[PDB]
Amino acid sequence: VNSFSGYLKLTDNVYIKNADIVEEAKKVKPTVVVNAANVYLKHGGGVAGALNKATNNAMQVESDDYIATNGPLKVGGSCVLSGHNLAKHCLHVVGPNVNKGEDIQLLKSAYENFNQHEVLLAPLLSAGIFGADPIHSLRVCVDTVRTNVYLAVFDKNLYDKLVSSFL
Numbered sequence: 001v002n003s004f005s006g007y008l009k010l011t012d013n014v015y016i017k018n019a020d021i022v023e024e025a026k027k028v029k030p031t032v033v034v035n036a037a038n039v040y041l042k043h044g045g046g047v048a049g050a051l052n053k054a055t056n057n058a059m060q061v062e063s064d065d066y067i068a069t070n071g072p073l074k075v076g077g078s079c080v081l082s083g084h085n086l087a088k089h090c091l092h093v094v095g096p097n098v099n100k101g102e103d104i105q106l107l108k109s110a111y112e113n114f115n116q117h118e119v120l121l122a123p124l125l126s127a128g129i130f131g132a133d134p135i136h137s138l139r140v141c142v143d144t145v146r147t148n149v150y151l152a153v154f155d156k157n158l159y160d161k162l163v164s165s166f167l
């Protein structure tokens with residue numbers, strides 16, 4: 001038994017809620033919050049910009065040091081950094097950005113990173129500002145992640161559509 005509340009069960013291991021991931025993080029303080037990152041860990045908008053603002057830019061400062069040492073992530077890749085005031089850890093995961101021509105098949109690789117963590121609070125990768133089909137992202141999540149994932153979907157209208165269309 002964990003501290004996530006009001007989630008709808010989709011599968012054995014996938015749960016979903018209409019919520020802002022930042023507000024869920026602040027309330028739950030989960031072991032792992034997933035950031036919808038880009039390869040440069042430049043946190044400007046969506047999940048990344050919202051989480052970073054909630055850390056008072058500490059996430060960006062830490063990320064800039066990570067990139068200066070290690071160089072960019074791969075599309076489909078990830079790194080574990082601090083969760084600051086929001087979680088123990090933040091798993092920065094790079095889904096493909098359709099608005100940049102990246103291969104949607106890399107979305108499965110992106111979700112595979114979740115399997116290294118027993119429980120995660122996460123957003124829908126590659127959807128929203130990243131330009132890919134959200135029904136598809138949820139399907140890839142369900143078919144790829146085997147650990148326990150609590151999905152926070154910000155847009156009410158999209159949350160209703162994801163639930164109603166779920167197979």
Ligand SMILES: CC[C@@H](CNc1ncnc2nc[nH]c12)NC(=O)CCc1ccccc1
Pocket residue numbers: 019020021022046047050123124125127128129134152153154155158
């Ligand atoms: C489905 C991907 C998520 C990712 N972004 C976030 N997910 C969770 N919490 C967040 N807090 C700040 N951004 C958040 N985008 C949204 O839900 C809203 C954008 C949108 C509007 C209309 C149709 C589809 C998508």
